[PDB]
Design a binder for these strands. Sequence first.
RNA 1: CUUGAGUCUCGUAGAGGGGGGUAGAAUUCCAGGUGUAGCGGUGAAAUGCGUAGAGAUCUGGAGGAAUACCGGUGGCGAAGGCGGCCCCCUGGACGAAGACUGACGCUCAGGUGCGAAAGCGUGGGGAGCAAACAGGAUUAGAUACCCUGGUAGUCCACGCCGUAAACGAUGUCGACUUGGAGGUUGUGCCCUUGAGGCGUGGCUUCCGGAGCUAACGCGUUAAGUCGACCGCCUGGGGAGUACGGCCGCAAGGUUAAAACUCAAAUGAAUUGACGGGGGCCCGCACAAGCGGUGGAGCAUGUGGUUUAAUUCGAUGCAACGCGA
Lengths: 117, 18, 150
Amino acid sequence: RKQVSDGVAHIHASFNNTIVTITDRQGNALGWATAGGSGFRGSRKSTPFAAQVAAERCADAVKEYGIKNLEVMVKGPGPGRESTIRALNAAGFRITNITDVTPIPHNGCRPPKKRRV
Amino acid sequence: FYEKPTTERKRAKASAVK
Amino acid sequence: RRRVIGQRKILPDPKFGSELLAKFVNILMVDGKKSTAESIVYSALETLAQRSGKSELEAFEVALENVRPTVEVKSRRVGGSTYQVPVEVRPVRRNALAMRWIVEAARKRGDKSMALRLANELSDAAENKGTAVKKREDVHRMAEANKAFA
RNA sequence: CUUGAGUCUCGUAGAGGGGGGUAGAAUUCCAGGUGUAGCGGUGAAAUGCGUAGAGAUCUGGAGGAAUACCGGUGGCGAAGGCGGCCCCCUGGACGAAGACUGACGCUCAGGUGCGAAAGCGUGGGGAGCAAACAGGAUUAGAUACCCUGGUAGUCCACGCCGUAAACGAUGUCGACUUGGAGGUUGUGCCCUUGAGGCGUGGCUUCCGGAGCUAACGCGUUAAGUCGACCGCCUGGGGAGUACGGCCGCAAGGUUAAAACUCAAAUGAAUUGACGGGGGCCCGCACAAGCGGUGGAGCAUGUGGUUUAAUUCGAUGCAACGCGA
C-alpha cells in the first residue's frame, strides 16, 4: 500500500525458533512470519528448513506492499540465521545490508545456570 | 563460572602455548 | 583408500572404432551375453542409426546433455556420524552412472524383444523421453536445497 | 665501628585499601505507537505466557546488579582478595645517588588483629539469579538430573560468625652454590641515532647436569649446602568424635581423648587396561556398483513333531548340499 520500497528486516534468530519481522526504519513492523510457527513445530523440524518457509510466507505476507531493496539485521545466533538470508533475497527481494547485532553485554546481569548433563 | 575462567585461561595455556 | 588404481585401458569399438561405444556393451552384460547382445544390443545399435536417421558416430550424444550428473550421495560417516555430504561428480563416475541410467527399465517391458526394446528408448532422449532422461530430475532435489546440512 | 636494621632527599609502577560521585551497554518492569497468532521449551512435552495484543520492532521511563574490549603464562596485597571512569584520604613496594643513627636485629608459646562463600542479628533494598517450595516431563521408581514459576539468600549499614582443596597441599629469616630462554618495572653508560647495544636493580614464568628425593620431581623464587627461632607428625578406623572448658544470639568453632576393631591403611611408579578418553592408521569393514539369498518351486542338511529307530557328533561369529 504505502510502498516504502525498502525496509530493515529483522531476524530474531533464537535457537528453538527464528521469527522474522519486516519493517522500515521507523520501527513499524508490518509483516512477520515465524520459523517454528510456520505450521512446523518441534525443534529439529523448526530448524532453518522452517526458516526459509517463514521467509517465503513473509514475502507473500508483504508482497502486497512492494518492497524491493531490503535491509536486514539479525538477533541471536542459530541455524535460522544464514539460510533465511538467501531465502528472502531469492524471494523477490533485493538486499541492502546484512548484520547480526545481537546485544553482547558489558557484564550486566546473570543469565541462568542451565543444563549441566 | 566465577572461578573456572581464570583456570582455563591459566590451563589452556598448556593447550595453546605450544 | 590411500592407494589408487588407474582406469582400465580399453580397445575401441570393434565396429565403429570408438572406445566410448565399446564401453557401453560392457555394462549391460548380465549372464555373460555379448554374443547374444550381438543379436540384442548390437542389433539394437545398428537400428539406432536409421531410426534416428543420422550418423550415430558423433551425433550419438545429441540426447545426453540433460543426462549430465552433478552430485550423488557419498556416505561419509565422518567421526562416526553419517552425513549427506554430496561430493561433486568426478569423471570416473559421472560417465559410468550415465550408462547406469540406461537399462533400468528395459528388460521385461512387454514388447517384441530387448533386441529392439532398447532400440526404442534411445531416440526418446532426443525425442525427449526414455530412462536416461528422468534420472537427472531427482538429483536436483537432494542437493542445492539443504545448505544448512548439505 | 659500619656491613645488619631503620630515617631523610628523589622519582617509577600498580584491579593495594577506604569514601564519594558518574557513564553506557544488558536482563527485567512500566507507559506508547505499528500491526500480528503464536511465544517460549527440550532428546519429543506439558505446566507456563498469551488473541485482551503476547512474542517481534522501534520510542521512551524506573530499578538493581555487575563492569564487555584492553586482559596477558599481566599487575598489586600478609593472606582472604583486588578489574568501567574520575576525584578525596591512605597503605606499602622498588630504583638513583647520596647523607644520618650506630646492632637499634631475626623468631615468637600465650596475646592481639585481619579472616572467600555460606550462615545469623536489626533495619532498608530487591533487576536478574536462585537453596527451599510448587507444577510439567523423565525413569522401574525420581524426593534428582531436565523445564515453568520461585522464597530466603545474593546487594547495602552496623554487629556476629570464624571456617575452606584458606593449596606453591612447600613457616619466617639469613648466607652460599653451573646455565638458557622469556615476562614486568626502575635505572647507568653507548652514535640510546633507534627500536636499542653494552650493564645494573627488583619482582617474575619455563626448561635443565650438579645435588637432593622413594619416586615423581625440585633445581639461585630449591624440595641443593648450612644457621636462628616457631608450628606440627608418630599404623588405619573410632575421630577431628565424646566429655570439660573457653567463645558464639544461634548455627556451631577451637581445644581434644578413650573404649573397642583390623593387620594393614598409604605414597611413586611399572607391565596388563576396560572407556559411555582421544588421534591415527589399516582390511567388499564402510563407501559405489554388480551379482545374489531371503519370493516361488524343487534337492539335501539342521531344529522340532510322529515313529521302532527316525542312530552319533557340530549346531554364536568358526554348524545346518557337515562329518557322511
